[PDB]
Paper text:
In addition to fragmentation of the rRNA, we also noted three occurrences of protein fragmentation in the conserved bacterial homologues uS3m, uS4m and uS7m, each one of which is split into two nuclear-encoded fragments. We found that the rRNA contains a non-canonical reduced form of the 5S, as well as a permutation of the LSU domain I. The mt-5S rRNA is stabilised by mL40 that is also found in mitoribosomes lacking the 5S, which suggests an evolutionary pathway. Finally, in the exit tunnel, mL128 constricts the tunnel width of the vestibular area, and mL105, a homolog of a membrane targeting component mediates contacts with an inner membrane bound insertase.
Ribosomes consist of the small subunit (SSU) that selects aminoacyl-tRNAs cognate to mRNA codons, and the large subunit (LSU) that contains the peptidyl transferase centre and polypeptide exit tunnel. Both subunits are composed of a catalytic rRNA core and scaffolding proteins. Mitoribosomes of green algae display a great structural divergence from their tracheophyte relatives, with fragmentation of both rRNA and proteins as a defining feature. Here, we report a 2.9 Å resolution structure of the mitoribosome from the alga Polytomella magna harbouring a reduced rRNA split into 13 fragments.
Residue numbers in the entry:
A (entry chain Xc): 37 to 93
B (entry chain AB): 114 to 163
C (entry chain Aa): 57 to 362
Write the structure that this text describes.
Amino acid sequence: RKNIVWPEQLEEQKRNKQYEYQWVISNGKKFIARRESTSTKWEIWKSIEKVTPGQKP
Amino acid sequence: MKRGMTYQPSRKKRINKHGMEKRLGTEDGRLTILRRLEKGRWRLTVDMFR
Amino acid sequence: KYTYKFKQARAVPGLVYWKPRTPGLRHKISIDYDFLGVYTGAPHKDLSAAVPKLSGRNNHGRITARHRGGGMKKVLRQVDYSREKVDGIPGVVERVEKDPNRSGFLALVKYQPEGQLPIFKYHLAPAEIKAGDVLLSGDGAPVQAGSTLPLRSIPLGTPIHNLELTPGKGGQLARAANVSAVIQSKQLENAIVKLPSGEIRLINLDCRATVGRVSNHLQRMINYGKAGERRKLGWRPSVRGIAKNPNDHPHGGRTNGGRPSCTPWGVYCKGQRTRRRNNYTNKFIITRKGGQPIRKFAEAKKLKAR
RNA sequence: AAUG
RNA sequence: AAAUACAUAGCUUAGCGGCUAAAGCACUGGUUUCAUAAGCCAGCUAUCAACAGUUCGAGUCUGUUUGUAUUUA
RNA sequence: GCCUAAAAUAGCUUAAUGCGUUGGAGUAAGGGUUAAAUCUGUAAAAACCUUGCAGAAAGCCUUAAAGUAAAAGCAGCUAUUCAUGCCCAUAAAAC
RNA sequence: AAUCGUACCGCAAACCAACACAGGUUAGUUAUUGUAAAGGCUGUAUAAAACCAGGAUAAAGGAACUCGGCAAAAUAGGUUAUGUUUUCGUACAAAACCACAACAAAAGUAGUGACUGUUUACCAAAAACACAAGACUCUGCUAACACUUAUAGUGGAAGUAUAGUGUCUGAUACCUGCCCAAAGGCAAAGCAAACGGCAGCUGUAACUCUAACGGCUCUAAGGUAGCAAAAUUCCAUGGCAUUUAAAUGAUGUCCCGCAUGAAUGGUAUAACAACUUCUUAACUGUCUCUAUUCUGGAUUAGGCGAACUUUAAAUGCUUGUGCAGAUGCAGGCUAGCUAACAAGGGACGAAGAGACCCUAUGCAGCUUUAGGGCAGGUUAUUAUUCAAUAAACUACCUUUUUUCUGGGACGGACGCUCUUAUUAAAGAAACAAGAGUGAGCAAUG
RNA sequence: UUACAGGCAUUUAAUUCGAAGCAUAGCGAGCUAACGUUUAGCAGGUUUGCAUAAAUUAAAUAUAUUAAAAAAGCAAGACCGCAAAGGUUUCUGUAGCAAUAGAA
Ligand SMILES: [K+]
Ligand SMILES: [K+]
Ligand SMILES: [K+]
Ligand SMILES: [K+]
Ligand SMILES: [K+]
Ligand SMILES: [K+]
Ligand SMILES: [K+]
Ligand SMILES: [Mg+2]
Ligand SMILES: [Mg+2]
Ligand SMILES: [Mg+2]
Ligand SMILES: [Mg+2]
Ligand SMILES: [Mg+2]
Ligand SMILES: [Mg+2]
Ligand SMILES: [Mg+2]
Ligand SMILES: [Mg+2]
Ligand SMILES: [Mg+2]
Ligand SMILES: [Mg+2]
Ligand SMILES: [Mg+2]
Ligand SMILES: [Mg+2]
Ligand SMILES: [Mg+2]
Ligand SMILES: [Mg+2]
Ligand SMILES: [Mg+2]
Ligand SMILES: [Mg+2]
Ligand SMILES: [Mg+2]
Ligand SMILES: [Mg+2]
Ligand SMILES: [Mg+2]
Ligand SMILES: [Mg+2]
C-alpha cells in the first residue's frame, strides 16, 4: 500500500492551513468569517467577543 | 423465479449515470449530444426540465 | 505436521486446546495471549490508522492478487524498523502487543529526550524482551538481545535479525516469527551473512541489525479448525485447475492433468526458474538456496547454446 | 566338500 | 464373418533364394566319488504345419485347406 | 579445607575425515577382489602445496573399574549448581 | 430569523411486473395467560346431474397396492435402573413410570462424502465444488507474479523464506512398493506426492490333483501390501450360508481382477446427511372394494364478453382400388329434421419450415508433436550510453483437414492391358467373375 | 463501315425475398456475479467449556480455613423453534393469478 496518511502527517497539514478573513455584521453583532485557501466556501467562525483582532489565534 | 423486474427506479442513480453533467464530462458523451442535436430531438437528456 | 495425538496430550504451554465439543472445535489449536502476557487490545492512537480493504484490486479496479477480501476491519500500525532517530536516548518497554497483519509481536517503547516530551514508538519485539526492559541503540551499547548496532561491532556467531540491505533505509531481511541470521566472516568492506533461507550473501559493513531472534515461537503449532476462521482473516476459497473447463485453465478438459503441471498462464511450476539469469544483483550472491553456486545459475543456458 |  | 501377426529335433530358440541348418536345456556313453548330485569329455536327434504353384534351385517367394493369438460386429 | 570416570546447566579446544570448496603446479589413472567388474576420471580426477564451510568423536594419560553410580551406567578442557568421598576437629540422657 | 420538503397512495385498485396481476417491496410502533383494546374491511339469482379439485367419516382385513409405503395415517412429549459403540465430547437400545387446555412423528444394515457450508435464476441440490489439513516447486526485496502501449503508475505489501506465488491430494487413524530407457518438458548432466508405465512360455511331490522347487526369451521396470462378484465382472440371475410359504433382492463368505491397486492416493472410521439401498415396529381407503357427505367449479337463469383454428363444403358404414392405411374413386349396403348434456376411436386432429439421420461454396467454439507467421514475456547472440535479429519454450494471430458407397461410419478402391456371360458386325453396366503390369534387351535392334 | 430497333453475353447493389455468421465504433453492473464504504435486523427456550469484585456477603476470627447463583461476562460455522432466507417431495395450474405461480 503505497498511499497511507499517518496521524503525524494529518496534524502537520492541519497546522499548515491558510485562511482568508472577513468581518461581517449580523443583527448588530460582529462576526468573523473565513474561507480555506483551497476551497470556495465561506463560513462564520466566531464572534468578536471570543476573538482578539490583530493576533494569531 | 419471476422475471421482468429489471428496472428498480432511483432518482440519484438516474442523474449520475445519464445526466447532462455526466454527458459533458467525456469526449464520447459530447459527441452523443451533438448527434441528438443533429437529429433534432426536443429533449436532449433525461435530466432536462424548464 | 499436525497429528491428533499432539492435541490430545495438551502439553505445550501457551496454547489453547479447545475441547472437541463440536465438529468445528475438534482440531482447533490457538495461542493463549493472557498466559504469555501479550496485550491484545486497540493500538496506540498516534501510531495507527484505519484504512479500507483493497481485496487485491489495483488502481485500474481489476483483480491482480487472487483469493483476497471479505474479512474484518483493517487497522495498520506504524513500526520504526530503523532506530537511528533515538540513537543515544534509552527506551523503556511498556507493552508487548499482537498485530494480525504480521506473525511476530510488536513492542511499545517510551523515550524521554532531555528537554522534550516523551516519545512513543513501535519496534519489532526481540525474542526475550518483556515489559519494563530497557532498549538501547547506536554506538556504545552492549551486545545483548534488543540492541541495534552496525555490523562492524557484532561478533560472528551472534544471531541477528531485522537486517538492513542499505545503510540507512531500514531493516528488511529477517522479520518473520522465530527467524534469525548469522555472520560467518567480515571482509574489508563487506560481511558474509547467512540468511534464514540458507543463502550466503554479501552485505555492507555499515548496515545495522538487532541482536536476538523474533518474538513468537508458537507460530507452527497453530491449527485453524474451520473454513470460516480464515475467512475472518481475509482469505477466499480457490478452485483446482483440473476442476475447471478448458476455456478457464490449461487443465480444464475432462481428463485430469493431460499436460505437465503449470500456472494458469502455462508456465511449468514444478522446478522452472523465474529469477533473471542476468540480474544485476548476481554480484552480491555467493551461494543460492540449496548450495548452488551463483556462476552455475548465471551461466547455464549459455553453455547449452554453445 | 550339498546329500545319505 | 472381416483385419493384422504365427505354425521351426523331446522343449525354448538361429534362419527368410546357392545345397536342407546355429545355440542352449533334455537324452546316450565315458570320467571324477564309498555311492548320489554338481563339475569335466565325447556323441545323438534326414531339424524346417499340410497341398498346389513360381524359379536352374525355396525352411525362405505367391495362393488354398487346417490350428493359435490380437483387433472389430 | 581439599578431591571426584557422580548428576544437571553453560562456555571453549581440534588430530583426522567429507565436499556440485578457492588459487598454484601437474597428467593418466583412482578404487576394489580368491580372480574380476560395477563405480570415480581424462570435457583435467587421485596424489602434492594452499582457501573456505560442516558434523560427529574424544590419541597418549588409561588400569582394573580399584567410582560402585541403586541398577541402567561412568574418563576432551573450564566454570556454576548440587550430591558424595577424604583428612583434621567436634556432637547426642530417653528417638 | 434566509432557502427547499409538507396534499393523496405507500403489503398496495395509485410503487416494480404491458392489467384493478393469487407475484416482488425497507424501517419504526400497538392490544392479547387458554386470548385479543383501538382501527379497518364486505359477496349477481338457485339447486336433490356426471365428472374434477380441497376436506370429513367408515364394517372385517392391514402393504395383499406399486418401479418404489408415492400419498395418507399413527402417543407424538418428558425421567429411567441396565447394555452396546466411541475420536471419551458424543450417539443408540431399554421393562416401567410421569402428562390440565394448545404444539407434535422412528430405528437398524450396506454404499458414497469427514463435518457446518456452496451450485446449473426457468426440468439435475448430488457421491459434484469448497473446506480445515498433507506434500511438491518457485521467490533475497526495485522479490517471484498480475493489470497496463509502458518509458509510467498500481496490486503483492509496506509484508520479508515460521513470508508470499502456483499445482495436485482433501478431517482424523494405519500405510504409501519398482522404473527417468525411447519421444518431449524442465534442471545444477538431475527430476515421478511433475505429465506417464509397471510381461510371456515350459517341466516337476507316495493314488490323483496342485506346484513348494527348476529351464528359457524379452524389457527402463515387469503390479508389492491391501482390497475384490465391487458406483469397477463380458460368461452371470457365478458357488455356499442366513433372510421368505415362494428370493434376477439384501447381508456374510470363496477369488489373477474381460479391464483392482496405493497422494489422478489404498484400507478402515465415531458423529453428521430433505443423498442412494435393504429390513423391523406401528399405522393406515395404497389395496381386497368402495360407499356416503361438506366446501368450490362444472351444470340452470340474467348481465358482460376472449383465444388457438379456417382453400371451398350440402362432410355415413364396409370390402376392393390407388404416391402402396379413403367422409369425397368402384361394387355391396344405408331414408324423419336441428340441436342440448356426456365420452374421446378417426379427420395420417391443433401448436413449433424435425432436435434424430444424411446432404452443404456451410457457421461457430474447443483440442493437438496438422501447415505458416512473430506481434507480449523468458532465453540466446550482438551493439549504443527504454535497442536490433530469431528453425527454441510459453501466449497470441491466421489457414487446411477428398470423392465413390443398395443411408452414413468401419473395410476396400481410384492409371493402363488380356479373358468370361449379354451368340456367330461393332458397342454395351454393377463394391460382377478369372488373370497380368508401373519392365527388360548395346542385342533380345 | 456508321446509325437505329431487337436477341444473347461481360462488368457495376443487377429477377425478388430469406440465414447462421465476420469486421469497426459506441451504449450498458438500477437484473445478476465478486468486492468497497456506511447502516440495520434475527420472538421465546435448551445444552456445554471458561470467567470474581476500588474492599461480594456471612462465619471462622491467630493458625488452618469453610459456605453460598457471591458474576447485568466471553466462547459455539452448538440444538428445538416465531419472524426471516430458501426451494426437498407431492398435488394443482400449463396463452395460467404468474413468459416459472398456488397449497401442503
Ligand atoms: K481448492
Ligand atoms: K485436461
Ligand atoms: K448450520
Ligand atoms: K495428479
Ligand atoms: K442430502
Ligand atoms: K376424438
Ligand atoms: K437398402
Ligand atoms: Mg464440470
Ligand atoms: Mg534332499
Ligand atoms: Mg376401515
Ligand atoms: Mg408386493
Ligand atoms: Mg457432504
Ligand atoms: Mg447441509
Ligand atoms: Mg434448475
Ligand atoms: Mg443439499
Ligand atoms: Mg430441484
Ligand atoms: Mg489427511
Ligand atoms: Mg483410479
Ligand atoms: Mg478420495
Ligand atoms: Mg356455478
Ligand atoms: Mg382402403
Ligand atoms: Mg366409402
Ligand atoms: Mg425441415
Ligand atoms: Mg460421401
Ligand atoms: Mg447453528
Ligand atoms: Mg437448527
Ligand atoms: Mg439459490
